């Protein structure tokens, strides 16, 4: 529903990257974090392609003595991950509505079983 | 509460790596993933030190067509790559120590930018 235009933006932005190469192992990702969770929720729903899959929204730990929500985006190759980092950054500049998420590229040693 | 014995195992195991070393930035972590949430929950509650902080349990995606176990995971954020591997060992010790605990797969994590954890 609400995350739909954002989805199409990434759809043509990522281009070839969205399609999945069965050989590549899921070893990199992009973590987005902000204070407004529903924004991340729409980001999570938007980044759903064969080649780029976002996990659900969750938190980072903070010592109690404001919650920080985050969403992890998993991508087949390091090249793609940077692209996702740009993709959102473009949307943020493109659409003034969208809040400004901080982010960081993620590097896994051992691959993950996203598929097969 | 139920993850008290597990917490104390790590408390002594990690030793000084549990401390802050405040100069350090958080750019490393360890992702644990398996098919049993509540084991990961207990892990998450156990890993809670000044130098090692675990996020809550979450999932990894799967595609609609794929038959899947609905695997869950927890991130364990750290000071340095030094602590991150130690974390990986710490859990493996507990897994070999206590046969009860299901054997989680895991992976050391590396971040580009530091995360806001202080
Ligand atoms: Mg803006």
Residue numbers in the entry:
A (entry chain E): 1029 to 1093, 1097 to 1147
B (entry chain F): 1029 to 1146
Question: Could you give the paper's own sentences about this structure?
Answer:
Among the very few genes expressed during latency, the latency associated nuclear antigen 1 (kLANA) is the dominant protein expressed in all KSHV latently infected cells. LANA is required for the replication and maintenance of the viral episomes and thus is essential for latency. kLANA directs the replication and tethers the viral episome to mitotic chromosomes to ensure efficient segregation of the newly replicated molecules during mitosis. kLANA consists of 1162 amino acid residues divided into at least four unique regions, comprising a proline-rich region, a central acidic repeat region, a putative leucine zipper, and a dimerization and viral DNA binding domain (DBD). The distal C-terminus DBD is self-sufficient for both dimerization and DNA-binding. The DBD binds to specific sequences present within the terminal repeat (TR) of the viral episomal DNA, termed as LANA binding site (LBS).
Here we report the crystal structure of kLANA DBD forming a novel non-ring structure in the crystal packing. The structure was resolved at 3.8 Å resolution in space group C2221. The kLANA DBD structure determined consists of amino acid residues 1019–1150 with an additional two amino acid residues glycine and proline at the N-terminus resulting from the 3C protease tag cleavage. The asymmetric unit consists of four dimer molecules. The central two anti-parallel β-sheets of two monomers form a β-barrel dimer by burying several hydrophobic residues with an average buried surface area of 1123 Å2 per monomer. The three helices α1, α2 and α3 from each monomer flank the core β-barrel structure, α1 and α3 is involved in the higher oligomerization (see below) and α2 is proposed to interact with the DNA major groove. The tetramer interface forms a bend angle of about 102° between the two dimer molecules and is related by a crystallographic two fold axis. A similar interface has been reported previously but the angle between the dimer–dimer interfaces are 96° and 74° (the corresponding reported bend angles were 90° and 72° (27)) forming octameric and decameric ring structure, respectively. In addition to the bend angles, a greater rotational angle between dimers has been observed in the present structure, indicating more flexibility at this interface than previously known. With respect to the non-ring crystal structure, the relative rotation angles were 26° (octamer) and 14° (spiral). This ability to rotate may facilitate kLANA's cooperative binding and bending of DNA.
